[PDB]
């Protein structure tokens, strides 16, 4: 919730309208246990965040706000070489670092598909 809340400040800090006040959050927060406990409540929330939150976005910040909290979660909680993957891959699509992901993992192996053949908004 720490990570989620000081992203959307971040957000927020880029444009007058982007704004997120902490009481709309906690109030997502309280919605998650209205509509492994800890962890459907930990994915209930990213949901319901990105739910609420994301229609407050543009088309840029939306997929930028997708991504960022797709890597929040996945990072801690899958294993290291899932992280390397998705990092060697925002370098990637970033154009800052080329590279090969180690693939033995079928979903960076559709999004590595998709790098090599340029389906860039894929």
């Known amino acids: 919730s720490v990570k989620i809340f000081s992203m959307l400040e971040k957000f927020g800090q880029f444009h007058w309208f982007y704004g997120i006040s902490i009481g709309q959050f906690l109030s997502c927060f309280k919605r998650v246990f209205i509509k492994t406990r800890v962890d459907e409540i ?34 801690d909680i899958e294993s290291e070489q899932y992280k390397e993957a998705v990092l060697t891959m925002i370098g990637v699509l970033s154009e800052s670092s080329d590279g090969v992901p180690k693939l033995t993992n079928d979903d960076l192996r559709y999004l590595w598909d998709y790098v090599t053949t340029k389906s860039y908004i894929s």
């Open 42 to 75: 930990l994915w209930l929330l990213y949901q319901e965040v990105y739910c609420q939150f994301s229609t407050a976005l543009d088309k840029k910040f939306k997929m930028i706000m997708a991504m960022t909290m797709f890597c929040l979660y996945k990072f």
